[PDB]
Amino acid sequence: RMGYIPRYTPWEWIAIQEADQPLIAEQIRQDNIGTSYFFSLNRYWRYKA
């Protein structure tokens, strides 16, 4: 071959690059209650809106 560079990254290399980095838990964005109309914008000052 002598100079072969792939134009598609192989499935093993994609799997290794996926298996090394964690997930963000807020990416799931699940919601079943509703919006807190009174409290969510008036929470504690360090974590406030």
Partner 1 sequence: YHWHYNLPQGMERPHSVNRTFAAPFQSNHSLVNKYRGVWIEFDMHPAFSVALEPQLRKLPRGRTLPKTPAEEVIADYTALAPLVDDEKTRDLWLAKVFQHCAFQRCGGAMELWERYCHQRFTAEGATAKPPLSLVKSVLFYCNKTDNSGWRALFDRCLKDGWNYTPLFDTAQWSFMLKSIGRMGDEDGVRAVLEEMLDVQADLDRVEARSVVIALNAVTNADVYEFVKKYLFNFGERKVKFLRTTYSDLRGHGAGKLRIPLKENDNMYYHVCWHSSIRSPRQPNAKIDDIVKDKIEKWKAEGLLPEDY
Partner 2 sequence: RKPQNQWEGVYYYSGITKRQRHLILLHRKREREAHMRSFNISRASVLQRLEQLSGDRKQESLPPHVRLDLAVRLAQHGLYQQATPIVDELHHQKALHAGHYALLINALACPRLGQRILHCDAQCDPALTYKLLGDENGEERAQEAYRWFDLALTSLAVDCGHFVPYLPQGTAAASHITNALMRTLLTCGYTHVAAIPDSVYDRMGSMGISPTISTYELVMLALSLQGNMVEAESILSFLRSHHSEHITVESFNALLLGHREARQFDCCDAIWQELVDRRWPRASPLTAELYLRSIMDHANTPTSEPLQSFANINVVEKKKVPLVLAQMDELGVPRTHLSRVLMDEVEDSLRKFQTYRSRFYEWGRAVKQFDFIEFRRRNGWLYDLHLMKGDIYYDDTRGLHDRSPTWMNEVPETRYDRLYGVNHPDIAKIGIRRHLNVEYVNRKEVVERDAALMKKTLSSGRRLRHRVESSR
Partner 3 sequence: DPNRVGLNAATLDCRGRIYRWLRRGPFFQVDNYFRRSVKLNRDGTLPTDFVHEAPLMRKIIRLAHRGHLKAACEEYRRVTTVPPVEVYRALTACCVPGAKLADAVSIFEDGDSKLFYVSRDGEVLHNLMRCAIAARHRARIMWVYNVMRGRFYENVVVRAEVDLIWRYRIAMIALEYLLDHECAEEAAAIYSYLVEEELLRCDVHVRVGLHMREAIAAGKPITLNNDVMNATSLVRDATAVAPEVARELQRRHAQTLQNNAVEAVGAGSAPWSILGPLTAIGPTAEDTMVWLQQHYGDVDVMSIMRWARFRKGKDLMAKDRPQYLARAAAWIELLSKRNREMEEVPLTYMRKSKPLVLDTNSNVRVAWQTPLMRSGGPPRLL
Name the residues that contact partner 1, by CB under 8 A: 5-7, 9, 12-13, 16-17, 19-21
Residue 22's contacts (CB-CB under 8 Å, 6 or more residues apart) are: none
Residues that bind partner 2 (CB under 8 A): 12, 15-26, 28, 30, 32
Question: Which residues inside 1-49 make contact with partner 3, applying CB under 8 A?
Answer: 32-40, 42-48
Q: Which is nearer to partner 3, 13 or 43 (CB)?
A: 43
C-alpha span between 22 and 1 (Å, rounded): 37
